[PDB]
Design an enzyme around this catalytic site. Structure first.
Site, short mmCIF file in Angstrom:
data_model
loop_
_atom_site.label_atom_id
_atom_site.label_comp_id
_atom_site.label_asym_id
_atom_site.label_seq_id
_atom_site.Cartn_x
_atom_site.Cartn_y
_atom_site.Cartn_z
CD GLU A 1 1.70 -34.77 -6.75
OE1 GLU A 1 0.84 -35.54 -6.28
OE2 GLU A 1 1.95 -34.73 -7.98
CG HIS B 1 -1.79 1.27 1.25
ND1 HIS B 1 -1.73 2.17 2.29
CD2 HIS B 1 -2.69 1.77 0.37
CE1 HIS B 1 -2.56 3.17 2.06
NE2 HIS B 1 -3.16 2.95 0.90
CB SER C 1 -0.38 -1.96 -8.20
OG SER C 1 -0.64 -2.71 -7.02
CE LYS D 1 -9.70 -5.77 -15.37
NZ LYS D 1 -10.25 -5.61 -16.74
CG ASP D 2 -10.70 -8.25 -7.94
OD1 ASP D 2 -9.73 -8.13 -8.73
OD2 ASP D 2 -10.97 -7.40 -7.07
C1 HEM Z 1 -0.53 -15.33 -0.40
C2 HEM Z 1 0.39 -14.72 -1.14
C3 HEM Z 1 0.21 -13.43 -1.81
C4 HEM Z 1 -0.85 -12.58 -1.79
C5 HEM Z 1 -2.15 -12.76 -1.06
C6 HEM Z 1 -0.51 -11.47 -2.61
C7 HEM Z 1 -1.39 -10.42 -2.80
C8 HEM Z 1 -1.12 -9.39 -3.66
C9 HEM Z 1 -1.98 -8.35 -4.00
C10 HEM Z 1 -3.36 -8.13 -3.50
C11 HEM Z 1 -1.36 -7.55 -4.86
C12 HEM Z 1 -1.93 -6.32 -5.47
C13 HEM Z 1 -2.07 -6.60 -6.96
C14 HEM Z 1 -2.58 -7.99 -7.18
O1 HEM Z 1 -3.61 -8.38 -6.60
O2 HEM Z 1 -1.88 -8.80 -7.83
C15 HEM Z 1 -0.09 -8.08 -5.08
C16 HEM Z 1 0.82 -7.52 -5.91
C17 HEM Z 1 2.11 -7.97 -6.00
N1 HEM Z 1 2.62 -9.07 -5.44
FE1 HEM Z 1 1.66 -10.25 -4.37
N2 HEM Z 1 0.72 -11.63 -3.11
C18 HEM Z 1 1.21 -12.79 -2.67
C19 HEM Z 1 2.43 -13.37 -2.93
C20 HEM Z 1 3.42 -12.70 -3.61
C21 HEM Z 1 4.71 -13.18 -3.76
C22 HEM Z 1 5.15 -14.50 -3.20
C23 HEM Z 1 5.40 -12.24 -4.49
C24 HEM Z 1 6.79 -12.21 -4.95
C25 HEM Z 1 7.76 -13.03 -4.56
C26 HEM Z 1 4.50 -11.20 -4.76
C27 HEM Z 1 4.84 -10.09 -5.46
C28 HEM Z 1 3.89 -9.14 -5.79
C29 HEM Z 1 4.24 -8.01 -6.64
C30 HEM Z 1 5.57 -7.74 -7.24
C31 HEM Z 1 3.15 -7.27 -6.79
C32 HEM Z 1 3.20 -6.02 -7.62
C33 HEM Z 1 1.95 -5.27 -8.10
C34 HEM Z 1 2.35 -4.19 -9.04
O3 HEM Z 1 3.56 -3.97 -9.23
O4 HEM Z 1 1.51 -3.77 -9.84
N3 HEM Z 1 3.30 -11.51 -4.21
N4 HEM Z 1 0.03 -9.20 -4.34
#
Ligand code: HEM
Ligand SMILES: CCCCCCCCCCCCCCCCCC(=O)OC[C@H](COP(=O)([O-])OCC(O)COP(=O)([O-])OC[C@@H](COC(=O)CCCCCCCCCCCCCCCCC)OC(=O)CCCCCCCCCCCCCCCCC)OC(=O)CCCCCCCCCCCCCCCCC
Ligand SMILES: CCCCCCCCCCCCCCCCCC(=O)OC[C@H](COP(=O)([O-])OCC(O)COP(=O)([O-])OC[C@@H](COC(=O)CCCCCCCCCCCCCCCCC)OC(=O)CCCCCCCCCCCCCCCCC)OC(=O)CCCCCCCCCCCCCCCCC
Ligand SMILES: CCCCCCCCCCCCCCCC(=O)OC[C@H](COP(=O)([O-])OCC[N+](C)(C)C)OC(=O)CCCCCCCCCCCCCCC
Ligand SMILES: CCCCCCCCCCCCCCCC(=O)OC[C@H](COP(=O)(O)OCCN)OC(=O)CCCCCCCCCCCCCCC
Ligand SMILES: CCCCCCCCCCCCCCCC(=O)OC[C@H](COP(=O)(O)OCCN)OC(=O)CCCCCCCCCCCCCCC
Ligand SMILES: CCCCCCCCCCCCCCCC(=O)OC[C@H](COP(=O)(O)OCCN)OC(=O)CCCCCCCCCCCCCCC
Ligand SMILES: CCCCCCCCCCCCCCCC(=O)OC[C@H](COP(=O)(O)OCCN)OC(=O)CCCCCCCCCCCCCCC
Ligand code: HEM
Ligand code: HEM
Ligand code: HEM
Lengths: 385, 54, 93, 248, 248, 93
Positions: free
Chosen positions: A272, A202, A206, A228-229
């Site tokens: 797996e 936050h 993004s 969209k979700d």
């Molecule tokens: C339970 C695991 C995770 C949850 C719930 C989560 C949730 C989210 C959410 C809500 C966002 C906002 C945009 C979107 O929904 O994609 C986001 C963005 C992002 N997440 Fe995750 N994420 C998770 C795991 C990860 C992991 C493991 C990585 C990287 C190693 C990661 C990297 C990112 C990045 C780079 C964004 C960038 C959005 C932007 O640049 O526009 N996330 N994630």
């Protein structure tokens, strides 16, 4: 002043679901991330309702799985949904990774976010292995044996630590008991880490798909991106239904459904599908300590990606060579997994070694030199003298 | 004198933290009955020539 | 509240983006227009244009690795096909 | 790895219940159980399923009680402490004739025989490969292969050596009708029977899946429509940049 | 809440193992086990203690084995599956003499014989209460009280009716030397033994508790001092008011 | 962060309490103070005066309930003492 933004328990939810100015040009990958979150929550819920009817002893762990299969009203749905939702969760997480790597979200202003995320990645891999041990089929026992023995590569004292983590000199009651308790514990720690993930996200919104500033215009969170979700989560529900009802035993491997027998093992023992890529590089190099260190080194070489991508222009939406190399890298990754699945014979050791070489090479040296060439070409093209 | 008091507190606290962590960690170690070092005997009279007995 | 670190995106009103003047936007409201405009024409035409634009980036890597996979499979098949006494030994080591 | 130790890939038989809407033809389980009990009596186990689930899927009712009156299951101790045996009921499992494990390696002249109750879930190409293995045996072993005496050959099994005494002959079962005495019939019936016992839940699983697929497809289309609807409030906007007067 | 239904409140005996710094007098556990094995015999169970924890606490190393080879335990079968009996080893529990449960209710002429392995940790009071039960029987049954046949009286059992008689007579154990013929002695030995078997961790627990209480007391006093120290920067500040100039 | 509701306490510099003037707080620093300036006089005298000033507030309720409990107990064991036919049946039954 509007009650939505006044009460604290609701002023929190307002800034994260009701009013969060996402960028204008969003595509379906961030909706895919939301899909991943919902997959996690349904996994947690069905896991609770699973453990509600699951025993823990080694002698009565397989019988517990057959009992959840049939002798509970509307229960086979629970077990298949747990397993196939886990596999689909891992696939969607891999695609979340690949998206992040492609679009250059790992640029400097989000390094904390990216590190936290890869911590969720390693934790989730651990959770999957823990649960797969919790099943204690036939090959899961051997997988647990090998992965516990992995730590014996530690110099000097290696036997004491493995014997400690392995609950004795044999796979017995403390082994599976501790494995199941830790498996039931860890996803809440994942939940804590992902609330941290949201916190870190936050701070700076993004990224645009264009790899350019998005502070110009933004559109409100709710009533635009919630749907969209919704569309993508409905797609997920239907595909999961297709895989859970008509085609149950495809993503997994049909070997877990065997009682544990530490006397005979089949010649075809593989993880797996979502652990094949690392298993390939483990079996590739011909050493114990080298492989054990090089797995976590694959994770660390993932880590090292920032302050290495030295392109002044963010993302790979306007670099033909860079995006071509990324595609060669993702096809590299899938090839690596598949060759890991196949048996090792004469024409495969060289194949795997070259695969690992090009993999780590793409992380280390391909990105900088290619990026520099792109940058210098961009400068030279549009300059007179 | 003040720093000596603070250091004494730290020393006692460190010893206690070590003791508590050791207790919790040694909770997970091998228990007693698991240490039953089993012994087996094998009959070699009826074993086949070109066969493996486990 | 406790002041926090510098941030590259503010909230509404103090969003932080460069100030601009003369830009004019519009809208027509969802209820005054057909939800499905183009539906098919844009579907087919834009789909083919997009697939044409990026065809090679997915074609080339797939072809390269398919060629590798086919060669590896065929050599493995030849290895264990009436060749385990004259070719397998000289290359296994 | 050579094909000899890899096993022939299972031919893709056009099975009766291998369909998106097709259900188990449990007009055939009624004889699949019959043949299983008649031929595989003292060799395998099937020691997982309980008789209170065959009623309503294969058999009517009183037949399972009439069969359970043939087995004993070591009731609770009496007043004097002497253990007793009482006839089975609708809360018991089928007893594999080998008591615990040892008679298995004692009598088969080989290894343990796996519990069939879940066997056709734990082999690649599960639905087939058991019909294939039961009928794919050749009369004479392929020339040029030496095997331990007393064992039997099977080209479809990895390694091509199995201790299956080929008891799948003809003129043996005679179910109730004119249909057995051909080795395809018993193999097919046992195959479907085992494919059922691995999950005696196929019928309702398919029904529920059909319901879910229809509901989710309808909801998908509705969601696609609504997204096209409320998103149109911004997708159709326009911008007309009118540069300001250069005064500063 | 009458006296008859509740039984005499337990007295305050002067134990030997009581006290914050006292271990067991387990020069007598060595004979407490002896008398227990002689007199309890095939009545009570004690099926929760393993012969690998009476070594180094009451018996040196080898006597535990030298009686362990006097029992049977029904371990794994031979090559023919027939279950086999072998002499006991050092990591196996004491067998409850009554096989499962029924011979118990057939021989006690009454209710179940309660498990001794945790009895004295599972009764109100208890450290003295077992002693009171064992020595509380009047030599003559009370006058003018109804009593069902068979059961013997107790002024300590809540309800005043115990299903077991009083086999605690004199000159019937003879441990090794001059000591028996004092039923108080056998009662003392057995109660110490059962208080040990309820928790074979008394000595170590007391030692660890002493260490912890010393460390914590020292730490607490240090914390008192430090709180008095760095809080003293505000527990002595003084305010002096000044009437501000009245101008506005 | 989004603006939040009005609050009667803030952070340092905007406590929001009434503005004060003329207050002049002092200090002595903890090192040069000899902490236990008063450790026996203060202890005994203040402890006893504070125990005196708030003595009745616990004596009265505790004494009331102790008297109540004693009466209830004594009547209870009077019931089950050679009186189960004459006193018990007139209230219990
Ligand atoms: C339970 C695991 C995770 C949850 C719930 C989560 C949730 C989210 C959410 C809500 C966002 C906002 C945009 C979107 O929904 O994609 C986001 C963005 C992002 N997440 Fe995750 N994420 C998770 C795991 C990860 C992991 C493991 C990585 C990287 C190693 C990661 C990297 C990112 C990045 C780079 C964004 C960038 C959005 C932007 O640049 O526009 N996330 N994630
Ligand atoms: C013990 C049972 C009761 C415990 C109740 C809980 C006490 C608590 O939370 O801590 C408050 C604690 C400190 O009070 P504070 O909040 O810092 O100051 C407010 C005072 O009450 C302000 O009032 P005051 O100080 O006038 O009267 C209270 C007086 C009361 O203190 C007494 O003299 C206790 C007797 C009267 C009170 C009786 C109980 C009430 O406290 C003191 O005298 C101060 C502490 C004196 C001990 C200083 C130790 C120096 C370090 C020694 C290091 C030795 C190292 C050895 C090796 C390691 O009060 C005590 O003194 C109780 C702990 C001491 C018990 C010793 C046994
Ligand atoms: C069984 C499970 C036990 C679990 C225990 C868990 C820890 C309990 C810790 C108790 C605690 O924090 O005590 C507070 C602490 C209360 O003293 P403070 O921190 O000055 O707070 C003032 C009070 O609210 C009262 O204000 P004040 O200045 O009027 O004090 C009058 C004092 C009345 O006590 C006296 O006059 C001292 C003589 C008592 C002997 O009342 C008490 O605080 C007595 C409570 C303790 C007895 O306990 C003390 O009384 C300190 C010792 C003096
Ligand atoms: C898997 C295991 C996970 C847990 C694994 C934990 C492993 C480590 C456990 C703790 C081991 C050490 C504990 C005691 C530390 C200590 O007493 O440090 C106090 C010092 C004193 O510092 P001072 O004198 O107040 O100020 C400095 C003035 N000088 C001297 C520099 C001029 O100050 C310092 O040294 C710096 C601050 C004190 C240390 C931070 C607080 C410690 C809290 C410990 C909480 C847990 C107990
Ligand atoms: C997931 C796709 C379905 C998996 C599947 O269909 O099967 C599992 C296949 C291999 O299975 P296989 O080709 O070895 O055939 C044996 C089974 N009949 O995983 C793969 O190696 C491809 C994906 C792994 C590497 C890419 C990871 C992507 C993230
Ligand atoms: C009640 C005591 C419970 C702890 C216990 O039981 O810890 C057991 C130890 C003693 O046992 P031991 O270490 O000597 O056992 C050694 C052979 N296995 O107690 C103590 O030292 C208590 C000291 C605690 C001091 C406070 C510690 C605060 C930091 C904790 C960090 C975590
Ligand atoms: C089951 C197998 C199905 C095979 C076909 C799958 C669907 C392919 C659709 C391709 C339609 C032809 C090309 C576009 C022609 C066209 O656009 O014709 C005009 C309309 C829509 O144009 P418009 O009003 O949106 O243009 C908007 C601006 N003038 O089209 C149709 O109503 C096609 C109806 C048949 C379907
Ligand atoms: C085992 C049984 C123990 C019983 C005693 C328990 C502890 C009670 C101690 C009470 C001390 C008497 C009250 C204060 C008297 C006094 O003030 O006398 C003088 C001194 C302290 O004077 P001051 O510095 O406080 O004066 C402060 C104002 N200028 O006193 C003591 O140093 C007593 C030391 C022995 C204890
Ligand atoms: C996203 C996190 C999780 C993942 C990816 C995950 C994954 C898995 C997997 C792959 C299995 C193996 C089951 C199979 O072989 O069919 C499994 C088993 C299991 N999981 Fe989880 N799990 C997760 C979280 C949880 C949680 C939170 C619980 C409990 C609250 C839970 C409870 C179980 C149980 C009880 C089994 C039993 C094994 C079975 O019956 O097959 N899991 N999990
Ligand atoms: C006709 C119904 C039968 C079916 C469907 C059946 C099914 C199977 C299956 C699936 C296996 C394991 C195959 C695998 O590992 O891939 C197996 C193994 C075995 N079966 Fe059966 N079986 C049948 C009858 C019998 C009979 C009648 C006997 C004994 C006479 C027998 C004895 C064995 C033995 C000994 C093995 C294991 C030994 C080996 O691997 O060589 N089976 N059976
Ligand atoms: C000196 C050795 C013995 C000890 C230490 C002992 C200990 C105990 C204890 C603690 C109880 C439970 C008292 C209560 O419920 O709170 C009990 C009850 C009982 N004992 Fe013993 N006992 C001994 C000898 C025997 C013998 C020799 C027999 C059998 C012949 C016997 C049979 C029973 C029975 C049947 C009860 C159950 C009565 C009831 O709960 O209604 N005991 N014993």
């Amino acid at each position: 002043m509007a009650f939505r933004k006044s009460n604290v328990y609701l002023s929190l939810v307002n800034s994260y679901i009701i009013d969060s100015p996402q960028p204008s040009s969003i595509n379906y990958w961030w909706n895919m991330g939301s899909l991943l979150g919902l997959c996690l929550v349904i996994q947690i819920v069905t896991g609770i309702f699973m453990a509600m009817h699951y025993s823990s002893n080694i002698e009565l762990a397989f019988s517990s799985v057959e009992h959840i299969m049939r002798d509970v009203h509307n229960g086979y749905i629970l077990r298949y949904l747990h397993a196939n939702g886990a596999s689909f969760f891992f696939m969607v997480m891999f695609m979340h990774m690949a998206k992040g790597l492609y679009y250059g979200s790992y640029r400097s202003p989000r390094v904390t976010l990216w590190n936290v995320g890869v911590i969720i990645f390693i934790l989730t891999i651990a959770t999957a292995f823990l649960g797969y041990c919790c099943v204690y089929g036939q090959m899961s026992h051997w997988g647990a044996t090998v992965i516990t023995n992995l730590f014996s590569a530690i110099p000097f004292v290696g036997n004491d630590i493995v014997s400690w983590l392995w609950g004795g000199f044999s796979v017995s009651n403390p082994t599976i008991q501790r494995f199941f308790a830790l498996h039931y514990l860890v996803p809440f720690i994942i939940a804590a880490m992902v609330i941290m993930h949201l916190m870190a996200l936050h701070i700076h919104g993004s990224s645009n798909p264009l790899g350019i500033t998005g502070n110009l215009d933004r559109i409100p969170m709710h009533s635009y991106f919630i749907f969209k979700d919704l569309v993508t989560v409905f797609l997920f529900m239907l595909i999961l239904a297709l895989f859970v009802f008509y085609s149950p035993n495809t993503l997994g491997h049909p070997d877990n459904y065997i009682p544990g027998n530490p006397l005979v093992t089949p010649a075809s023992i593989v993880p797996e599908w979502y652990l094949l890529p690392f298993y390939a590089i483990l079996r590739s190099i011909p050493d114990k300590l080298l492989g054990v260190i090089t797995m976590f080194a694959a994770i660390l070489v993932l880590l090292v990606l920032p302050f290495t991508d030295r392109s002044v222009v963010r993302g790979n939406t306007f670099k033909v060579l860079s995006k071509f190399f990324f595609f060669i890298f993702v096809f590299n990754f899938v090839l690596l997994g598949q060759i890991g699945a196949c048996h090792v014979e004469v024409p495969y050791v060289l194949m795997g070694q070259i695969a690992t070489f090009i993999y780590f090479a793409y992380f280390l040296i391909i990105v900088p030199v290619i990026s520099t060439i792109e940058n210098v070409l961009f400068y030279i093209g549009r300059v007179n003298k | 004198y003040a720093y000596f008091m603070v250091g004494a507190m730290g020393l006692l606290s460190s010893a206690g933290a070590k003791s508590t962590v050791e207790t919790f960690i040694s909770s997970m170690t091998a228990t007693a009955d698991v240490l039953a070092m089993a012994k087996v005997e094998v009959n070699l009279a009826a074993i086949p020539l070109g066969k493996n007995v486990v | 509240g406790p002041p926090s670190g510098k941030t590259y995106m503010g909230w509404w009103g103090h969003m932080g983006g460069p100030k601009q003047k003369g830009i004019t936007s519009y809208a027509v409201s969802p209820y005054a227009q057909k939800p499905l405009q183009g539906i098919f024409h844009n579907a087919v035409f834009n789909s083919f244009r997009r697939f044409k634009s990026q065809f090679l980036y997915v074609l080339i890597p797939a072809g390269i690795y398919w060629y590798w996979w086919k060669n590896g499979n065929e050599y493995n098949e030849f290895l264990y096909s009436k060749a385990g006494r004259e070719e397998l030994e000289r290359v296994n080591v | 790895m050579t094909a000899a130790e890899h096993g022939l890939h299972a031919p893709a038989y056009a099975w009766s219940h291998n369909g998106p809407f097709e259900t188990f033809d449990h007009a055939s389980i009624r004889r699949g159980y019959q043949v299983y009990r008649e031929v595989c009596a003292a060799c395998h186990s099937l020691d997982r399923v309980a008789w209170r689930t065959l009623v309503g899927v294969s058999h009517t009712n009183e037949e399972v009680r009439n069969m359970a009156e043939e087995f004993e299951y070591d009731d609770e101790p009496d007043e004097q402490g002497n253990p007793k045996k009482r006839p089975g009921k609708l809360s018991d499992y089928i007893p594999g004739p080998y008591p615990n494990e040892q008679a298995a390696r004692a009598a088969n002249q080989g290894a343990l025989p796996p519990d069939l109750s879940l066997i056709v879930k734990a082999r690649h190409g599960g639905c087939d490969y058991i019909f294939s293995l039961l009928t794919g045996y050749p009369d004479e072993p392929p020339a040029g292969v030496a095997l331990p005496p007393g064992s039997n050959y099977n080209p479809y099994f990895p390694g091509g050596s199995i201790a299956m005494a080929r008891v799948l002959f003809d003129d043996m079962v005679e179910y109730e009708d004119g249909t057995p005495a051909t080795t395809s019939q018993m193999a097919k019936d046992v195959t479907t029977f085992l494919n059922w016992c691995a999950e005696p839940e196929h019928d309702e699983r398919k029904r529920l899946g059909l319901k879910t697929v229809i509901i989710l497809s309808s909801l998908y289309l509705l969601s696609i429509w609504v997204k096209k609807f409320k998103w149109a409030g911004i997708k159709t906007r326009k911008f007309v940049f009118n540069p300001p007067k250069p005064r500063k």
